[PDB]
């Protein structure tokens with residue numbers, strides 16, 4: 001993995017690790033999931049951790065987070081369409097910088113307006129300034 005790839009994998013880890021202690025717990029995962037419109041049970045949350053908890057300490061650290069990421073990037077298209085609907089709040093089929101800003105805000109992240117534009121620009125393929133589903137699939141999965 002390149003160094004750019006790595007510092008971004010470290011930013012994703014920070015969204016889930018709210019308290020910043022280097023571990024992702026079931027309570028931190030349930031907080032993120034609910035901020036994304038989901039509602040996992042206590043058992044579903046433990047299962048998410050158990051699938052990648054190699055050392056058996058009940059939490060997810062950075063190596064196990066990178067293993068979880070490599071798995072999700074399965075062929076469960078519904079998981080991707082569900083995530084798209086969370087960004088696409090007005091449902092018109094295109095994620096705007098404003099809608100994307102709103103999502104990061106509900107995850108409590110402090111971001112600049114340009115930083116949101118950089119995020120759109122990297123997922124944008126046709127150049128229309130927004131992210132449709134096909135571009136979303138390629139951003140979320142190993143497609144292309």
Ligand SMILES: COc1ccc(S(=O)(=O)N(CCO)c2ccccc2CN(C)C/C=C/c2ccc(Cl)cc2)cc1
Pocket residue numbers: 012013015069072073079080082083087095100119120123131139140
């Ligand atoms: C239901 O399954 C999920 C769960 C969480 C997310 S996630 O998006 O929270 N996520 C970031 C934390 O790892 C993520 C998770 C897994 C894989 C990829 C990502 C996206 N990252 C790389 C940055 C993405 C940047 C980006 C840009 C442009 C647009 Cl329009 C939208 C997003 C997605 C689907």
Ligand SMILES: [Ca+2]
Pocket residue numbers: 017018019020021022023024025028
């Ligand atoms: Ca933590």
Ligand SMILES: [Ca+2]
Pocket residue numbers: 052053054055056057058059060061064
């Ligand atoms: Ca662990």
Ligand SMILES: [Ca+2]
Pocket residue numbers: 087088089090091092093094095096099
């Ligand atoms: Ca939209």
Ligand SMILES: [Ca+2]
Pocket residue numbers: 124125126127128129130131132135
């Ligand atoms: Ca686009």
